[PDB]
Amino acid sequence: FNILLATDSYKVTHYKQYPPNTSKVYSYFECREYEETVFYGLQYILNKYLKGKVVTKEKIQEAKDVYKEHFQDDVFNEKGWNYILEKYDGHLPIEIKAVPEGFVIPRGNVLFTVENTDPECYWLTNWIETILVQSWYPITVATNSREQKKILAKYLLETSGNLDGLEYKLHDFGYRGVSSQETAGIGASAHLVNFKGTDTVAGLALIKKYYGTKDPVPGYSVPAAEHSTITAWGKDHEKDAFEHIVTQFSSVPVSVVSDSYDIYNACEKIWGEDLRHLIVSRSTQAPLIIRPDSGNPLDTVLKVLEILGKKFPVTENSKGYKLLPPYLRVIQGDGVDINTLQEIVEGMKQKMWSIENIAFGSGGGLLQKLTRDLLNCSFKCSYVVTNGLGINVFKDPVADPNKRSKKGRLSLHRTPAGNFVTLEEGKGDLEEYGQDLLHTVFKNGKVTKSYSFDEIRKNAQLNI
Amino acid sequence: FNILLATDSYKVTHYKQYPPNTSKVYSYFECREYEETVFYGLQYILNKYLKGKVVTKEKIQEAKDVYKEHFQDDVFNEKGWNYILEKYDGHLPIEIKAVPEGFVIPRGNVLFTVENTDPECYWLTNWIETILVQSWYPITVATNSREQKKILAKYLLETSGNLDGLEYKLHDFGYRGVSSQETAGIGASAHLVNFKGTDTVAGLALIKKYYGTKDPVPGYSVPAAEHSTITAWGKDHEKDAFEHIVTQFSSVPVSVVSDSYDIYNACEKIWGEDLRHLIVSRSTQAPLIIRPDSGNPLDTVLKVLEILGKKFPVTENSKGYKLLPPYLRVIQGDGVDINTLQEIVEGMKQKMWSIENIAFGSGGGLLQKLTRDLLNCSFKCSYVVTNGLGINVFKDPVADPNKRSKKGRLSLHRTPAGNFVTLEEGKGDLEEYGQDLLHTVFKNGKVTKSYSFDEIRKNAQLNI
Ligand SMILES: CC(C)(O)C(=O)N1CCC(c2ccc(NC(=O)n3cc4ccc(F)cc4c3)cc2)CC1
Ligand SMILES: CC(C)(O)C(=O)N1CCC(c2ccc(NC(=O)n3cc4ccc(F)cc4c3)cc2)CC1
Numbered sequence: 001f002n003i004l005l006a007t008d009s010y011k012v013t014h015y016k017q018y019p020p021n022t023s024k025v026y027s028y029f030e031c032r033e034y035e036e037t038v039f040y041g042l043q044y045i046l047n048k049y050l051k052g053k054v055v056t057k058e059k060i061q062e063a064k065d066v067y068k069e070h071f072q073d074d075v076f077n078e079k080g081w082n083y084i085l086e087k088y089d090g091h092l093p094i095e096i097k098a099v100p101e102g103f104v105i106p107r108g109n110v111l112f113t114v115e116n117t118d119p120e121c122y123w124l125t126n127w128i129e130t131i132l133v134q135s136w137y138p139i140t141v142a143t144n145s146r147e148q149k150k151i152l153a154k155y156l157l158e159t160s161g162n163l164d165g166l167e168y169k170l171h172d173f174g175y176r177g178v179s180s181q182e183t184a185g186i187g188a189s190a191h192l193v194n195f196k197g198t199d200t201v202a203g204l205a206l207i208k209k210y211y212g213t214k215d216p217v218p219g220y221s222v223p224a225a226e227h228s229t230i231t232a233w234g235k236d237h238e239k240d241a242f243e244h245i246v247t248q249f250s251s252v253p254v255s256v257v258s259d260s261y262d263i264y265n266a267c268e269k270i271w272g273e274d275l276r277h278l279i280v281s282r283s284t285q286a287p288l289i290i291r292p293d294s295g296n297p298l299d300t301v302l303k304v305l306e307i308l309g310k311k312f313p314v315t316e317n318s319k320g321y322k323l324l325p326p327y328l329r330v331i332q333g334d335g336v337d338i339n340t341l342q343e344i345v346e347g348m349k350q351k352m353w354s355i356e357n358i359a360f361g362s363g364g365g366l367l368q369k370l371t372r373d374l375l376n377c378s379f380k381c382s383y384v385v386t387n388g389l390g391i392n393v394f395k396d397p398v399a400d401p402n403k404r405s406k407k408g409r410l411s412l413h414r415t416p417a418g419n420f421v422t423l424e425e426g427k428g429d430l431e432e433y434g435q436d437l438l439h440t441v442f443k444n445g446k447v448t449k450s451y452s453f454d455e456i457r458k459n460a461q462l463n464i
Numbered sequence: 465f466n467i468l469l470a471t472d473s474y475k476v477t478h479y480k481q482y483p484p485n486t487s488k489v490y491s492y493f494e495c496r497e498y499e500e501t502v503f504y505g506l507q508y509i510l511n512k513y514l515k516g517k518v519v520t521k522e523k524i525q526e527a528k529d530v531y532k533e534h535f536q537d538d539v540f541n542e543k544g545w546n547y548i549l550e551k552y553d554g555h556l557p558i559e560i561k562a563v564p565e566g567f568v569i570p571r572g573n574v575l576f577t578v579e580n581t582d583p584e585c586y587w588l589t590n591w592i593e594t595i596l597v598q599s600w601y602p603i604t605v606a607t608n609s610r611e612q613k614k615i616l617a618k619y620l621l622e623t624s625g626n627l628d629g630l631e632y633k634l635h636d637f638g639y640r641g642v643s644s645q646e647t648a649g650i651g652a653s654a655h656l657v658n659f660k661g662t663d664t665v666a667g668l669a670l671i672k673k674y675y676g677t678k679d680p681v682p683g684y685s686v687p688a689a690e691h692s693t694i695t696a697w698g699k700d701h702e703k704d705a706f707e708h709i710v711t712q713f714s715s716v717p718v719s720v721v722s723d724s725y726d727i728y729n730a731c732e733k734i735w736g737e738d739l740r741h742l743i744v745s746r747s748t749q750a751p752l753i754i755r756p757d758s759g760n761p762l763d764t765v766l767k768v769l770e771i772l773g774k775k776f777p778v779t780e781n782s783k784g785y786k787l788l789p790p791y792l793r794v795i796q797g798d799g800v801d802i803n804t805l806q807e808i809v810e811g812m813k814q815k816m817w818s819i820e821n822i823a824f825g826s827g828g829g830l831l832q833k834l835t836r837d838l839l840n841c842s843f844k845c846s847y848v849v850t851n852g853l854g855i856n857v858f859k860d861p862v863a864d865p866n867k868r869s870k871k872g873r874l875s876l877h878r879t880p881a882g883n884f885v886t887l888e889e890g891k892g893d894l895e896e897y898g899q900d901l902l903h904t905v906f907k908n909g910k911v912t913k914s915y916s917f918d919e920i921r922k923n924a925q926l927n928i
Contacts, residue, residue: 008663009662010663013688180647219534232848261861368835393699398759
């Protein structure tokens, strides 16, 4: 990795664009005014990309050669990068202050600030905008996952009277559906801030290396079938595939995809009749989890439950909701996003089915179908010092008041009613509010404050 | 990187689910049912993740320890992975056949096939599905970028009579807007299959390392301002910022964001009057490129062009379209996706503005706002050998005929009219459609066939 090659091209040319005699460039990140966001992921970026000796003679030469060809001009700040190498042994003279990871903050608040600690590196602040703005992705996955947990918690509490097993109700199926191996790890780790069920193995090693848990692992899974393990038996031997699979995993929960040919037939005739004796004998700790994987997600879930309800002993829980026997559950793992998740749990409640009956698997909806636009994650310069005088800077486009940025030195505070407020123009310097909630997390090439994944999960807890 | 930890969790348990005495598992990839797709990105995955010694005793032990905790049980195939290490020195006994990279193929055709070369490794074929299915991402970026080039080519031809500078008309602004550094490189490289303009520097090194070009670089950029380089001068010194920037880059094209406070005022009064003398003196090789960055993308482009048309000398080209002087252009770099790109060029044509006047910058729309669902990229088992007998395997869900998969051994052929056809059930073995278009690209840990980035670009060319 070469940080000199880890920026938008045009940032290579910005050192010649700032006002002459500029000694400080101070910038901030916010999720411009999903009412609240989970701050997560910056510690990964600080450690993997920004800390320690990030500048070498070889990296400067490599960047110089690439940019000469890329621009067809010599515009690269070789002097500026050589200065950091000589004066700081390649360590970045930047100070980053951030809200603690896992913190749940309303939209339009300062989440982190960045500034150069040496007047000579005024240009460095926004050089690293590209890399830091990528924190939008773990913030957005964590936020969107937590919003799904709110929906699940609400319906599980209403239909059962408690939240038991809530952290296993939304499983990450997104490994194949993301854009890269790196994204897989980051995205899966952000989902694990709220849940404990994952198939995206990449997430485990990222948490282990960059965050850490008291438990050996932050996420868990169970044995499960795929179409290849069912269909490999041949179209006429679907029952043989099912029988073999539930017998191989007779003492642990087992998920079995049942829609290869006819989901409704598999539920009613194969599970419901032919193999019913292998299901009703299963432990409460080892249910069969039937998995539909096609059709309208709500219509399929309801029809599967109505079929199962007629083949298996259903009880009525203390809330008046229908409950399958404990050796039998359903996981809907196709077409799940925050919208369909809501439609399904509402549909189940209307048909008097407890949410204890179901779990959800989500791939693209959980880890890929997200953009920087969802939370309006934005990094902007708010303060500069030029000729020894600090000036409060901002943008305010005539056609879009929503794109107006904050002015001056910023600080995040608790209000008297316990809410949040971002103080602009250095007004945090007046001791009118409590202590600033932003802490120095990075300074002059060193990570100065870190959080465990356990601390992050506690911070991200729901009120319920 | 550890390939034993680079799969969906449930795939760890599949070796115990296939029929006993299974010696071959053969699977394929297609973009089920954007009528044609650019095949790109597999060579990156083959080299970075699949080739050479990918299994070590340490990797087996690391996977065993992780899975024991992740499943709360011993389900990991230690014996199977140790076999590959001992017999093949950790080289994968897999054979992958693929259509050449850059090839433009209609939907619903076999793009690549995977199968084990050792009967003992029947479980390996689908172990690597997760890693290979991630090729959906470079395929989708390349396809979506090429569809935008079709729109640009059509309107540029119609309004100017030629395609000059077409490959610089859609610039990649997506570095900050993607989910990771790895995704940035992959996505930027896929855009460069069709265009030559990029700010996502990560793309350059990926192409250099995995594909290669005759030219020193596959992509190019020009100096450009950002809001921080304008706003740092203070709200009352926007003219001073603009003057400094165009003077610093007086001999190369320069892009200048002009919407910090009032885009229309900046065009009419600042560029159009106060600084007009610094613009009209510019070389044809060094235009000022005015950049709006907010408001309705079409309304803003049209209004900016009407303002500029009244302040600067406009000509009528040979097609009857309005053309700004050669030292002045516009780039729309906000809210650009395939839909808005179409709306803008159509809007310009209706108001008699040549597409030579404009270029587009696209970030999230080009590299992030995409999913595996857009082209229905899918990997499925189509053929297995059990007890020495080959059987044609497929799925066919009752509620979704679109999810029906292909049967048996597959082959890709040219039809008599020069179109494409995927032959199923080993029917390619009959010499009726001639030679199979898929080539062995990977075999037993080695890449057996590769393409340069130059070969890929030629293959991906538009007919026009
Ligand atoms: C249902 C209840 C009571 O909430 C519960 O007991 N649990 C515990 C068991 C839990 C679980 C965990 C993993 C799986 N996995 C699968 O179905 N697969 C993994 C996949 C990965 C990728 C993919 F494309 C498809 C997949 C199918 C099922 C269920 C749900 C909650
Ligand atoms: C206009 C015409 C004739 O098609 C032409 O001459 N060319 C040549 C010059 C070309 C070009 C190349 C790069 C840039 N860059 C920028 O504006 N920035 C790069 C950014 C990256 C990220 C971001 F958030 C904002 C950005 C602003 C402008 C223009 C357009 C086609």
